[PDB]
Amino acid sequence: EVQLVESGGGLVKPGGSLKLSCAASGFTFTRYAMSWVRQTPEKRLEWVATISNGGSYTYYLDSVKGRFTLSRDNAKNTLYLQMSSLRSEDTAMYYCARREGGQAGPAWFVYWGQGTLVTVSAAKTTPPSVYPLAPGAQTNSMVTLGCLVKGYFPEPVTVTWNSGSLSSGVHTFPAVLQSDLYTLSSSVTVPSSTWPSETVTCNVAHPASSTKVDKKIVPRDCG
Amino acid sequence: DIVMTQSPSSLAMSVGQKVTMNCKSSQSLLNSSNQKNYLAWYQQKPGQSPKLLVYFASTRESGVPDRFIGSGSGTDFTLTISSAQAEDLADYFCQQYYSTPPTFGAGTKLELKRADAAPTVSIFPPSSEQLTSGGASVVCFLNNFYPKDINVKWKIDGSERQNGVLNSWTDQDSKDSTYSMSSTLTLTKDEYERHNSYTCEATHKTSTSPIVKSFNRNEC
Amino acid sequence: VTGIRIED
Ligand SMILES: *[C@H]1O[C@H](CO[C@]2(C(=O)O)C[C@H](O)[C@@H](NC(C)=O)[C@H]([C@H](O)[C@H](O)CO)O2)[C@H](O)[C@H](O[C@@H]2O[C@H](CO)[C@H](O)[C@H](O[C@]3(C(=O)O)C[C@H](O)[C@@H](NC(C)=O)[C@H]([C@H](O)[C@H](O)CO)O3)[C@H]2O)[C@H]1NC(C)=O
Secondary structure, eight states: OOOOEEOOOOOETTTOOOOEEEEESOOGGGSSOOOEEETTTTOOEEEEEEOTTSSSSSEEOOOOOOOTTEEEETTTTEEEEEEEEEOOTTOOOEEEEEEEEEEEEEOOOEEOOEEEEEEEOOOBBBBBBEEEEEOOOOOOEEEEEEEEEEBBBOOEEEEEGGGGGGOOTTEEEEEETTEEEEEEEEEEEEETTTTSSSSSSEEEEEEEEEEEEEEOOOOOOOO | OOOOOEEESEEEETSSEEEEEEEEEESSSSEETTTEEEEEEEETTTSSOOEEEEETTTTEOOOOOOOEEEEETTTEEEEEEEOGGGOOOSSSEEOOOSSSSOEOOOEEEEOOOOOOOOOOOEEEEHHHHHHHTTEEEEEEEEEEEEEEEOOEEETTTTTTOOOTTEEEOOOOOTOOOOEEEEEEEEEEEEHHHHHHEEEEEEEETTTEEHHHEEEEETTO | OOOBOOOO
């Protein structure tokens, strides 16, 4: 029952310091080499560093050399990854893993941890600006409404339509980073006979700034 | 620093069909002393950690399904899934451990194969509430289309615009296997009032003619 | 050994 628990990852500013811990159980910690592998927001697996079972020899990714320091504690079966001078290229999910293979060289990883999330950003907690999206004729039998959630940090934001009453035909596109802030959009499609006669409300809630804005979708006044 | 190339980036499959994935390295992972290739395969479901499938090119890990097949040598390696199943819809990475550092490929998404659907394009002008804050975001929703490969474009007054455009892609829908893409053109209120014709257009394999959605800044 | 990650 091999188990790997990562902790210590959190939100940190660029240049700040952060240390990730990795507790190991279910196996002999002194017999294996431990490693850190990170996965970027673009879902790219990137190896960080590898430490030998005795901690004598440490191997680090070249981009990270001089800033990340790997340290092993065979008395408590815990792996420590010191991170200094953190850059906005270091924000990724950091996975603790157990190296395999022989004494020399890299190897594959059978057992991975659930991973710590590390977010490097200089943005302060900012509430989203919630904007209604209204079409510019009822051509089709269906009408598509939308909702723009712009300029919020950190994540996440809960976006629902009519407090969950509108579930079918709802598309919530993932958040994108613009100017150190996040921005997503949500689209709902309803029959033409309902809107604008019936009320379609975009419900957004940002727990980090403790903000809740319910936006009524109003057809575009032109007079 | 070895470069792992995974082909293709996305893989459309049907349940029960044989699935092949390619992985190529800029160096030979063949150790002539033990005649063994140094290449591993990992599976990653969304929200989970990577799971080892096959190491040493063809050696399968314990517990991994027998349908997964590892093959290849030298600089070319292959992951094969005989009778692919809906549980196997995931990301797949290949990793070399011949040289230091360990490098992975970009990854290959395994997606469900479904019939082509044309996108449902909608365009939305900036809200007056955003215009009061000196900003203007033009949103274009392209919903319920397949395959994933779409070429959306923003044109302002007849000229294609690339600056200040952000796109977001949803995952493959678990009920109809379609895709949705949102494109937002962000520009200042003064930048929005300068031009009159905003047009969102995209090209998809479903229609040889590009789907166009426009609006005039002084028309509704 | 060159590149050791497991001491004897
Ligand atoms: C012997 O090779 C290793 C690398 O071995 C591997 C590889 O991963 O490249 C592993 C596998 O055994 C091989 N695979 C097979 C056989 O199938 C694989 C392959 O044969 C080819 O090498 C692939 O190209 O090789 C290193 O190259 C050893 O040399 C070391 O290189 C590093 C740089 O990467 C250092 O410069 C190191 O020099 C020291 C020093 O004293 O000056 C050594 C220190 O211990 C090192 N610390 C480490 C590595 O933890 C230190 C660094 O400066 C650190 O910043 C300090 O923390 O610098 C050098 O020895 C190589 N041995 C020799 C002498 O060739």
